[PDB]
Amino acid sequence: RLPTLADNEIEYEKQIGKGGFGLVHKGRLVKDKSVVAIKSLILGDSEGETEMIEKFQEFQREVFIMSNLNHPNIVKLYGLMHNPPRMVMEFVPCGDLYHRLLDKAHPIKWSVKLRLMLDIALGIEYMQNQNPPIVHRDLRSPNIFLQSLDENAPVCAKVADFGTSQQSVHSVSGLLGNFQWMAPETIGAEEESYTEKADTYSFAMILYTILTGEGPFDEYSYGKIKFINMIREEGLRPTIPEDCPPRLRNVIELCWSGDPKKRPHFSYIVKELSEL
Numbered sequence: 001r002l003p004t005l006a007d008n009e010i011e012y013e014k015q016i017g018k019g020g021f022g023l024v025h026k027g028r029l030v031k032d033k034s035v036v037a038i039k040s041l042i043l044g045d046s047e048g049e050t051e052m053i054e055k056f057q058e059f060q061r062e063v064f065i066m067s068n069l070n071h072p073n074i075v076k077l078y079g080l081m082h083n084p085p086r087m088v089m090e091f092v093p094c095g096d097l098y099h100r101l102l103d104k105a106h107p108i109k110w111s112v113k114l115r116l117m118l119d120i121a122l123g124i125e126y127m128q129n130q131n132p133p134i135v136h137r138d139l140r141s142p143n144i145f146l147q148s149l150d151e152n153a154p155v156c157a158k159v160a161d162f163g164t165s166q167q168s169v170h171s172v173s174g175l176l177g178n179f180q181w182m183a184p185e186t187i188g189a190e191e192e193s194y195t196e197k198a199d200t201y202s203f204a205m206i207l208y209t210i211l212t213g214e215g216p217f218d219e220y221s222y223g224k225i226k227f228i229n230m231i232r233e234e235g236l237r238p239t240i241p242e243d244c245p246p247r248l249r250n251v252i253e254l255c256w257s258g259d260p261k262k263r264p265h266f267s268y269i270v271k272e273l274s275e276l
């Protein structure tokens, strides 16, 4: 169930849109004075081929997945708008995890890192406890939005951008692109199936990037085919630093296991991370 907002129920402020299927605007709900992000669906008729205009299904997939999710560590969908088709999402004020980690002169302090780690873990835990489980398929640092970087804040990090997300009681397949973040069983061929355990692998890469501030696999340089082979067949993984807490190292290593079934349930992951 998703409520409908009219053009008068919200007021626009500005644009900040790097949108995949349109434009993103900042705005406010007239009722709450609540700050809000507006994601529009813009079909460029003078832009793309009839196969490219299948970004409609992405906008759709997002709406469908978002309508069932209600968790503090997942970006909330307030409602839907028409003409154009628009998603009304809560505004997350501190940017995303990818851009914040680029700032080397200002490293995130240890306690805040843990808040971020646990925040994302709780979000994904929620996703995997759904019936059927939510497979995000695009878990990476740009898709983690930062609510606050204060260690005592209610919510520090939120999971976002469920556009390529799949929710099926059966098996899910499809070759994914962004290989440095994605499970080995998702990057080799479309001809093989995978589960929500792929997200558990992606999460390990997110744990690594928070811990080191560095891009996963940035320490290596291979051609695409050689890179995919190493990850799949030779167990190529980013190097966990020697000073990393023993319990965090174990969580990361189990979460990026080549064998998907060895990647832990998030009840275990949350518990382990909370002991850090």
Ligand SMILES: Nc1ncnc2c1ncn2[C@@H]1O[C@H](COP(=O)(O)OP(=O)(O)CP(=O)(O)O)[C@@H](O)[C@H]1O
Residues within 6 Å of the ligand: 016, 017, 018, 019, 020, 021, 024, 037, 075, 089, 090, 091, 092, 093, 095, 096, 142, 145, 161
């Ligand atoms: N709820 C929100 N709160 C604050 N900013 C948001 C937001 N939703 C989107 N944005 C911003 O609007 C822009 C739109 O990006 P979008 O959400 O479409 O991801 P994307 O698909 O562009 C990631 P990539 O470029 O890697 O594919 C981003 O810069 C993001 O920071």
